[PDB]
Symmetry: D5
């Protein structure tokens, strides 16, 4: 199933824990994309966040994936279920 | 260039049943052509709703505007357009 | 899979009464079936209002979308769909 | 009577850990009790979020208020309460 | 149990003038009964607007729902319902 | 003159807990006096929330302003004021 | 006693031009009377828009409501009312 | 040329008491001057709130900006600006 | 003086396409004059929408108002007006 | 391609005055350059607020993103981006 997911990032104002967090975040998203759950990843133009499409088998699968993100504590997340559009040409 | 585009459809209640049929028909045909040529890259429907949430791939704002204006549904659409940029953490195209 | 769904009903003023009642009976029959079959798990009325707050139990987004699209009221419904996940503190079944 | 209740959790950042685990534990234990007793009927979590969306079954507004006020999390919660009524087309029990 | 209720009235332009009078007269008579019986405890006009702020005293969400649905104005009302609880610092009656 | 007044209270986390309970006292004593004087006419709690929903009865806007401004909680309150008028259908 | 009042005008536009002028005229007639007498203290035009920002000077809420209720435009107005108080730092007239 | 201007004040809680009084005094002094000179035409307080709702009478946007920018309170203000125009039905002379 | 002005167009579905063609031609002619004269300095269309986002450069609020009031489209427009000011970091002319 | 861009500046109260003055100076220098090069076409101040309304002239979403991301003020900005299209009734 497909979900359109928007995330905005707000990291704390305060060390070099920062750069290990960011590398950890980037490493996690690499795996999820490679394995197929994180189908699409874009950056909203002018923003610190992403707009994504996830392809998973349950609400809980998506929930756990998001929860597992290093950034999660600092994320504002919106989840929107997507359905097949009858006029679609090709695959959803 | 990529745009995330949301369209909400509000067709008049007083549409002649036959006219409404052919409006839907030409809309479908128009979006078919745009998908075939690639400008309308992704087309989905928000679960529980009419309309669509889409991703367009065009060369300029003006090209997208013309395309959207060309849709038979345009007079009855509420459209939100949102520019998308490459994400450095992206793996793939 | 569970979804929390809010529906608000706005029937046109100028609806022909026969049909309007024919439409209401149809809505009621369609929802009776979906409840009997288990897809429409919970159905409550938002007090003070003409609509409902529901929990649907289906196996895909598209299954839900088709169900909502099949409602006689659909053209007059304002719908909000919220995906629900398991809460670790939950005792018993979701 | 039934209420749809949404709770959004905003735990203090830069608040000691051992303390934070104790708080979460007492919250978890508190909701278990209430779920066992039946006042906290349904408990879900909105996909992608930290909080819960729930349905409470109590005998009065005051009883609900006291229950919510009793939650270890209460000082860090944003809470929306929405009364639920019987829906004429309901098949089965509310 | 107490409820705070905002009601805002929106009559259509096309409403037949004679039907409008019947609508208003039946509405006033309905509210008179409910105030005399005591379920409709307080009623105030929202100054500058066609609506009211009210406090209802009923035994359940369901009883409130039926009352509100029963109002002739109902098809033209936007209604916000808010459950009220006893306040600790309260002196006197509610 | 009647006003519907909503107050949401947001005490600071850093606030010394004893002052929280002495501020809560001053506040409790003030509302008591105002209710006894008829100016704080009705006082309810919004279910599930830390705040009140009230009806005040005073002779002018400025009078309401001074009363609210005088509350020990004022600096921590989010306040919404709206006027109420007599309703012709009132019984 | 002062109220800041915002008004948005939304006329049907499906009406007789001379009828529109009759409604328009007596609205302006009603507002002339209220400004002369003093209840309608100040009156400005919201720029780019068909509406006004007013300050009313009135001795009760009921007096303000009756005044606004009485306006020829009332059925076609969206109104916001906001009580004003004296500012301790005010040097001149209110 | 008239502007309706709303200002909401949010002084920080960790303010040095002396500084707070200094701040409040200089703000008051600045506003006195602007009112005396006629730029700050009207100055009211929204009832129940800490801020002001004002009408400024200046010659240009730029003038208004620099005036607002120069308020000691500025870094703690939330400000809304709205141009006003002369209303044809205006009896009297703003 | 500069104003950022957004206009959203809501033509009724009631228009004789003769009349619609006419309104459009008229609106276009008026904006031409206003652009040539310099009051309508910039004019863009928001991508995907039937409106315009514009910068006007006029004498006063009263002037902007009259200009907007005068547009053939005015009865069908939703307009937002927002004053702009010289920016300190601006390189060259505003 | 044109973009209408709104930016709101939210400098934290605890911002080291030394850091604040540095940022202000470098932000100003950066906007000067981008205006001189032409990508930052129009810049106005919202009357009575600490921000700006700008029109940017660039070749892609990505170019705009990189520009906005490079602003010294970026970590403290609320930014709204709005694509602009040619208006048929435009004169000159
Ligand atoms: Cl991200
Ligand atoms: Cl569609
Ligand atoms: Cl329903
Ligand atoms: Cl929770
Ligand atoms: Cl009423
Ligand atoms: Cl309280
Ligand atoms: Cl007016
Ligand atoms: Cl002030
Ligand atoms: Cl236009
Ligand atoms: Cl800036």
């Amino acid at each position: 199933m497909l979900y359109l997911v928007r995330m905005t990032v707000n990291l704390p104002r305060n060390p070099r824990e920062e750069e290990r967090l960011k590398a950890s975040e980037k490493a996690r998203s690499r795996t999820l994309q490679e394995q197929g759950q994180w189908r699409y990843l874009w950056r909203t133009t002018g923003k610190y966040g992403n707009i994504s499409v996830f392809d998973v088998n349950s609400h809980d699968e998506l929930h756990e994936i998001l929860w597992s993100l290093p950034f999660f504590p600092y994320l504002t997340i919106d989840v929107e279920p997507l359905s097949h559009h009858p006029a679609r040409v090709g695959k959803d």
